[PDB]
């Protein structure tokens, strides 16, 4: 009844891109939604790292000393694109610092260390099941989880389930209030998403996001919570893929899809 009250030209956008775009956006005030390929599976890529940090925060509700626990690691832990953790190789970092780095810089070594702490891909999947997400699956470690093979359900979710879970974790009751605000603050501090959903969001609105970029099959994504002033927040997810391994991803297409979603919800921006 409240889904796609206003049609938007997502099909033309994905056709110009040369692939598939999946969008699910929720107006948390009215419950109205914009939905396009929203129940199709798309590779998570590094977007799993946001949910990983939420899982760490959930564990910290039962383990008061978890976030400040110091974690030391060897050079063998430093995998490509570890911009924060490489600066602390000789010192270690706390669990909270690793979580912030995984969210805000997409730090690979940090994410691997935290994934191990949680019991691996199955442990993160179990956390997502515990909040009612039956779609999400993480199956592999980095960097193998970025393969983005057409038709492969490993390491995928849907735009809808990503949005639904993001809403539960940032605005709902899945985390206790201090942990919820910490998750929001990490998302707000993200540095890797300026050309994605954020590029569709006016500068005077608050926003947090987590990106993912697989590097193959035109596969990249972003999810965000957006606080337009004077109305309820919007939660949305934009995921892309394309048929050929060497197809390029596009940040501009993600931003454009986010703009269409806000327009479809009647959010003036």
Curated annotation (Swiss-Prot):
The active site is at 46 (nucleophile), 144 (proton acceptor). It is an enzyme of class 3 (hydrolase). The keyword Hydrolase applies. Pfam families: Beta-lactamase2 (PF13354). Not inhibited by EDTA, inhibited by clavulanic acid and tazobactam. Inhibited by cyclic boronates, including vaborbactam and bicyclic analogs of taniborbactam. Coiled coil: none annotated. Changing residue 155 to N: Reduces thermal stability of protein. Keywords: Antibiotic resistance, Hydrolase, Plasmid, Signal. It catalyses: a beta-lactam + H2O = a substituted beta-amino acid. GO terms for biological process: beta-lactam antibiotic catabolic process; response to antibiotic. A beta-lactam binds at residues 46, 49, 81, 106, 108, 211, 213. The keyword Repeat does not apply. GO terms for molecular function: beta-lactamase activity. Transmembrane segments: none annotated. Its EC number is 3.5.2.6. It comes from the Bacteria. Changing residue 216 to G: Increases catalytic efficiency about 40-fold with respect to ceftazidime and reduces catalytic efficiency about 10-fold with respect to nitrocefin. Initially two different KPC beta-lactamases were identified from two different Klebsiella (KPC-1 and KPC-2); they were later shown to be identical. The class A beta-lactamase family has a specific amino-acid numbering system, sometimes called Ambler or ABL numbering and often misspelt as Amber. A multiple sequence alignment was used to derive a consensus sequence and then the consensus was numbered taking into account insertions and deletions. This allows use of identical numbers, e.g. for active site residues, despite differences in protein length. UniProt always uses natural numbering of residues, hence there appear to be differences in numbering between this entry and some papers. Class A beta-lactamase which confers resistance to the beta-lactam antibiotics, including penicillins, cephalosporins and carbapenems. Acts via hydrolysis of the beta-lactam ring. Has penicillin-, cephalosporin- and carbapenem-hydrolyzing activities. PANTHER family: BETA-LACTAMASE (PTHR35333), BETA-LACTAMASE-TYPE TRANSPEPTIDASE FOLD CONTAINING PROTEIN (PTHR35333:SF3). Belongs to the class-A beta-lactamase family. This is Carbapenem-hydrolyzing beta-lactamase KPC-2. It comes from Klebsiella pneumoniae. The gene is KPC-2.
